[PDB]
Amino acid sequence: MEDFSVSASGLFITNEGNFQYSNATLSYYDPATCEVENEVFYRANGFKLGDVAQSMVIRDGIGWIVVNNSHVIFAIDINTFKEVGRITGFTSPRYIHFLSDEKAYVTQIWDYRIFIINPKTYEITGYIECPDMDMESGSTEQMVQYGKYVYVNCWSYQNRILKIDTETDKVVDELTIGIQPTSLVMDKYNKMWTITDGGYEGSPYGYEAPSLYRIDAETFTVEKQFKFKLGDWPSEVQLNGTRDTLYWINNDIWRMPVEADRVPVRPFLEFRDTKYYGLTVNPNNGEVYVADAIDYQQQGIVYRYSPQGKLIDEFYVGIIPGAFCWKLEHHHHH
Ligand code: CNC
Ligand SMILES: [Cl-]
């Protein structure tokens, strides 16, 4: 076991590792020193994260790491990386969304329910049943808040956004769109963005040209749709800190102002026959980080770009780096 006491400002990278090989890891990058630290959860705690580290949220000095195929969320000190607690019993957890210190939602694959937890006591307290959904093909994924409502995309073998009333913990509406919306963000106009992966060739569920959608939160209606090419396998809508510039992965890294009527001809970062897989925008300074899985086998590489697309830095992370979590001392945005 190793003692860490890292920067007040930094960047976590979760590494999924290889599904069913239990080689998921956590990386910590200091943008001021341009130094990366790899395998920091193992190094700090003396045991493995597990299988498919999916996502991470930082709240009140604690990092909540979702380990999808280990049925657990780890709570860590964001400075020492030491575990302060864990929640077990998740079917196959995906994303955590906090409503309070005592209430959060945890989405699942292979379950038709969203888990309700108490992060304070580290307990599962209840379940939200998704309509028209079973265990065999169930999927809830990313979440955004809109007043008293949480919106959630249904990804694997699903084609819906659900609306949850957080005051009753019930799904109160749904919207059917293209198959397998991957990810969900809310822009500063309270308009949601989601991008579909289009399924895959030979899928028992579907295989189609994928789309990027803008969905008004108030009317819960599609306002814009940008359809791509059959065989495209897009992912990971991401916003800048002012929530007026959208990024996503579709071979290339794409950038579009949220009020645009057309996807720009030119991508932010050109495809280079690798596997762009993870994406984030520094919420304070607009710097763009691209996690490249390369070939899903070797150590991944993160590329750090200026908001104008000029390379700043590049560093190795773990295998299949999938997600980022910002550790910021101050947020410039409200
Ligand atoms: C590439 C890939 C990946 N996939 Co697929 C995705 N997205 N996937 C695919 C594709 C594989 C073929 C291709 N076009 O390249 C593709 C699009 C067909 C696919 C399909 C699926 N995938 C699916 C899921 C959910 C997953 N996939 C990942 C394994 C997920 C991977 C991410 C990860 N962290 O592992 C992943 C990004 C990289 C796998 C890889 O090539 N590794 C390198 C390779 C050398 O190692 P490998 O051990 O031989 O990998 C093989 C397996 O991973 C297998 N496989 C891939 N996905 C699954 C899912 C399941 C349930 C099973 C049993 C096997 C697989 O295919 C690979 C090629 O043989 C996953 C961990 C991503 C995630 N972070 O959630 C996740 C499984 C989570 C879980 N707890 O079950 C689908 C259910 C998604 C969907 N509804 O479209 C579906 C299931 C197919 C099935 N039942 O076999
Ligand atoms: Cl680790």
Numbering used by the authors: 40 to 373
Article, verbatim:
Contrasting with Enterobacteria, members of the dominant genus Bacteroides often encode several BtuB vitamin B12 outer membrane transporters together with a conserved array of surface-exposed B12-binding lipoproteins. Here we show that the BtuB transporters from Bacteroides thetaiotaomicron form stable, pedal bin-like complexes with surface-exposed BtuG lipoprotein lids, which bind B12 with high affinities. Closing of the BtuG lid following B12 capture causes destabilisation of the bound B12 by a conserved BtuB extracellular loop, causing translocation of the vitamin to BtuB and subsequent transport. We propose that TonB-dependent, lipoprotein-assisted small molecule uptake is a general feature of Bacteroides spp. that is important for the success of this genus in colonising the human gut.
As observed previously, CNCbl binds to BtuG2 with very high affinity. The BtuG2-CNCbl complex is extremely stable, given that a boiled sample run on a denaturing SDS-PAGE gel shows a visible pink band around 40 kDa, suggesting that some CNCbl is still bound to BtuG2. An initial BtuG2-CNCbl structure was solved to 1.9 Å resolution using cobalt-based single-wavelength anomalous diffraction (Co-SAD), showing unambiguous electron density for CNCbl. This model was used to solve an additional dataset at slightly higher resolution (1.7 Å). BtuG2 adopts a seven-bladed beta-propeller fold. The propeller blades define a central cavity that forms the B12 binding pocket with an interface area of 698 Å2 as measured via PISA22. CNCbl is oriented with the cyano group (upper ligand) pointing towards the protein centre while the lower ligand, present in its “base-on” conformation, is completely exposed to the exterior, with the nucleotide loop sitting in the cleft formed between blades 1 and 7. There are 13 hydrogen bonds between BtuG2 and CNCbl, all mediated by the amide groups of the substituents from side chains a, b, c and g of the corrin ring and involving protein residues from blades 1 to 4. CNCbl binding is further stabilised by Van der Waals forces provided by 11 residues, evenly distributed across the blades. The cavity that contains the cyano upper ligand is narrowed by Trp194, Trp272 and Tyr316 (numbering based on the annotated Uniprot sequence, including the signal peptide).
